[PDB]
Amino acid sequence: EDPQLLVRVRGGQLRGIRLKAPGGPVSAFLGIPFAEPPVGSRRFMPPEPKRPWSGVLDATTFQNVCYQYVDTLYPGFEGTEMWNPNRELSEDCLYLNVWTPYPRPASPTPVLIWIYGGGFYSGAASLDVYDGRFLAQVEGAVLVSMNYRVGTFGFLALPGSREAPGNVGLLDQRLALQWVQENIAAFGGDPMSVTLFGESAGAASVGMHILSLPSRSLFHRAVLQSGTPNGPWATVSAGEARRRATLLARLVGCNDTELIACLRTRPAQDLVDHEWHVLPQESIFRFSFVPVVDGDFLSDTPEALINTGDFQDLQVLVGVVKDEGSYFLVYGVPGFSKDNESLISRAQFLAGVRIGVPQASDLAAEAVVLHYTDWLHPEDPTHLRDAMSAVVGDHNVVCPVAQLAGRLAAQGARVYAYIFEHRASTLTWPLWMGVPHGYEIEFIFGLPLDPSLNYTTEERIFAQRLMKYWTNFARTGDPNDPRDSKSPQWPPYTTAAQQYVSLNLKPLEVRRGLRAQTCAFWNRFLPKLLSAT
Amino acid sequence: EGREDPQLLVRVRGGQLRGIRLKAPGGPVSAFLGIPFAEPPVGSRRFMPPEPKRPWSGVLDATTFQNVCYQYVDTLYPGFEGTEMWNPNRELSEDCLYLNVWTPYPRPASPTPVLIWIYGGGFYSGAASLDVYDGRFLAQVEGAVLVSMNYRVGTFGFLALPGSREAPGNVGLLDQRLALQWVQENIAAFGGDPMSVTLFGESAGAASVGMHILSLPSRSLFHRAVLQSGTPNGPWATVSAGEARRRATLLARLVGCNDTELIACLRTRPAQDLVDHEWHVLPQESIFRFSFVPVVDGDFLSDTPEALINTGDFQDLQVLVGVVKDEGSYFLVYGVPGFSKDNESLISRAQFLAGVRIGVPQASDLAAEAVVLHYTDWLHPEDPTHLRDAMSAVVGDHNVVCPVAQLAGRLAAQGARVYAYIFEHRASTLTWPLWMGVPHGYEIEFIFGLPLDPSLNYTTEERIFAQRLMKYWTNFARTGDPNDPRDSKSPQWPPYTTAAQQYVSLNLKPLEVRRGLRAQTCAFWNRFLPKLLSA
Ligand SMILES: *[C@@H]1O[C@H](CO)[C@@H](O)[C@H](O)[C@H]1NC(C)=O
Ligand SMILES: *[C@@H]1O[C@H](CO)[C@@H](O)[C@H](O)[C@H]1NC(C)=O
Ligand SMILES: *[C@@H]1O[C@H](CO)[C@@H](O)[C@H](O)[C@H]1NC(C)=O
């Protein structure tokens, strides 16, 4: 028995496994339960703390993936499959993972907590691109990731009800955060230095923890990659949630109590079968069961909360990739496919816009088309295709991020912002998709450091830079290297100068204004136009 | 006659004329100035269509400019050349329907292409006798025959009670039309070719040229057209019948006045009383808006200019159109607070929003917001230099650049041959401040060739530049193409098309071809704004 691999937590004893990273061993404790399985009558309910166990719990392997829809658009294609569950599906899924240096840190070490994305309907902490061994080995970090309930299981809500209050998937995350506070010291983690980071719906989750008081004592700094709590997809009102839940119940053949009781009799796959059928419009970048503005977890809309919050003791790193919108086009916009160059017509552009901005009035959709049309080349299919991608990325990610960065900075937060512009040499999606949503993650987690993965040498060097910025940020709230002169420094994002940096193979370059003109259209004009209808 | 110069005696349909020999830098020219082309539109003829001048006896002296049509006189900056050069330079009178002819001396032996100038001035001012419209240089250097006419402006030319017999509207345009008919009948007496007539005008004169293109009875009176910084479409050049009726009747009230009775009472009023109140009838505080302009009467204009350029067939037409680099700037000192010729006019964000309401006076609150959001620099939203230049651009784009873009595109799509330009050289002799850039109206002195006059103090390069522009304009008049055939070396001026949207820059450097005339911004003005203000 390796003493490094044996740990006592409040619930009892755990046995981890020694893993191999390129530069040395790491200790991994995988599949640690942090909650009572949310099964049977506990479906849709807030999580409860895991009961203590006897003997030594085996934590040498990843646990089950929370029950979820599985992407089958391109069967066996690497680009889709790498996001799909890589362990058995189960509602019994509330487990977390810890990687630490081997031997375990002599002094309390900064902790990073990862929260996966996947539209709040999918994802798992066990995916290869979330492998924490590189950050632990190279940077001596303690890295944590948890599973949380997705889809109906995590976010179906009859607001006001006792038994389906909503946001229970965010409560799972929070319970894992509490677990880190109470237990991470046993692994050598420093509970007084905890940084949340996440991507897409994971980033929106992080933002929701920033905006919800009981979460605030559980972390100190946050990183939001390609996602925000504000914006068009990350939340629904109480009314729309109630509507969606009642429709789903109707669809599976199901007095909130009676309705929820009947939903609890249904096999998991029956719920998943109908989950996509409750969206009000044909759309992309829209998800059926997401966090709900409940007046509890979220005391108000994220927009209202970022406008009035006090964020003076907060540091945040936020950013986007160069082509946020591109991969969403192939899941519902006619004319777009991964298997050709997706050269679309003007008609397909206008139709694409109604799907990418499903909430738009005729006039709003016209404003969008006119803004994104290149009037020198109004019919050029290459411009129209790239414009369609920009519409989706700007509306769903870039402009919401620019808005959040500006509000946080105006309200006293220390903010750093980036645009990630390197396309992985190993990417299997076609060239026209550019640097797609999600494809910065492998570099931040340090996967290029594994020779067997076939990244280039420049990519290994680049990944090492990114691991440094992220862990520097975790340690200090500043991604700049504490020692090491030779610039250029990454300056804070401010409302005055709006500075951000490009992350690519070349040295940091500083830019000003994150799509400032176009985001002014989305953030300032669109709302008025929509209200005026 | 007996000892008079034999080259200066000419007969026209109405009688004999005696002209005068003028000195141009390169040699003499013939001028016949103050030729009546209509009965004086005075007394009971005020507000009425012009009647053709009745023959006179003896030799009419045509050696000096005639009266300027009664009009408001600009007094914002007293004694300042920048405003004075546009002011009347002959006596104001309702008896003002006269035209002017310059020709080579001695007169051309074979029929020469004719250029006809129609001045601007917002349809409320202007005169064919201003120094900047002097035809002697074009006549002398290019051998052109040049005509310019006075037409009624303000209430006298444009006050309308649509449907009445006594004040049908558009009579200033009918004054112009009558001058064009006069050219058809008489210009051959001067060596001019009635089968080659090119209209050109600036601002309201350009809008006028546009209206002759759109009005069938004018179409037989000219062959080609040049529109400088103005268009018949757009927000200022026409009013609906309803709005014209409303303005005429408010004006009648203001001066103490059944259409027949109202109009008869207006006819008893002193010309100057009409002028003193004309500005009081605009529906909002504004700039680049004028009280009495062409009206959509269903007669001269059978429909709005926008509809007529949308559905017209313009296959037999060649058109040259363009704009100066800073159309909007000088309009800002006549009514946007924060703006002045005498300082840098750095304004605040608040003054920008207020200026937008004045510059787009028809805008709803949301439309105004769209304009502000579009023109704001979101990296420097409060920067006074950017706000100042953005205010200028709002005014220039809304009133001139985008209406021109819309016109060029429609004309081309519908068969016309179109050439487009942007004029970018600021006269070295300009008295307006630098921040105004290359302001509205300041290409004119170059087209007419004033820099050839040594006493005007233009630079040598400006002299050469002026000669190039005279050439482009006269080549265009002669053949419908600004390019010189006997010179394939010089860069070519390609036609404007919907596909490529080419236009050229006019400056001291050789022609440079550019693409898209403020294409993104003009899509906002021409496609989106209309939909936004309906909603
Ligand atoms: C690319 O593939 C899609 C899906 O089959 C097809 O509809 C489209 O026509 C192809 N390319 C284009 C944009 O024509
Ligand atoms: C320029 O002059 C005008 C009128 O005198 C004035 O309103 C404006 O404030 C001045 N601008 C500045 C900044 O001096
Ligand atoms: C031209 O230059 C001369 C020499 O200084 C000057 O006396 C004259 O006033 C100038 N003319 C004009 C129109 O400015």
Numbering used by the authors:
A (entry chain B): 4 to 257, 265 to 543
B (entry chain A): 1 to 257, 265 to 542
Excerpt from the paper describing this PDB structure:
Acetylcholinesterase (AChE) terminates cholinergic transmission by rapidly hydrolyzing the neurotransmitter acetylcholine, and it is an essential enzyme for humans and other species. The catalytic triad in this enzyme consists of Ser203, His447 and Glu334 located at the bottom of a ∼20-Å-deep active-site gorge, where the residue numbers are based on the sequence numbering of mouse AChE (mAChE) that is used throughout this paper. Organophosphates or organophosphonates (OPs), used as insecticides and nerve agents, irreversibly inhibit AChE by phosphonylating the catalytic serine residue. One key step of current treatment of OP intoxication is to use oximes as nucleophiles to reactivate AChE by removing the phosphorous conjugate.
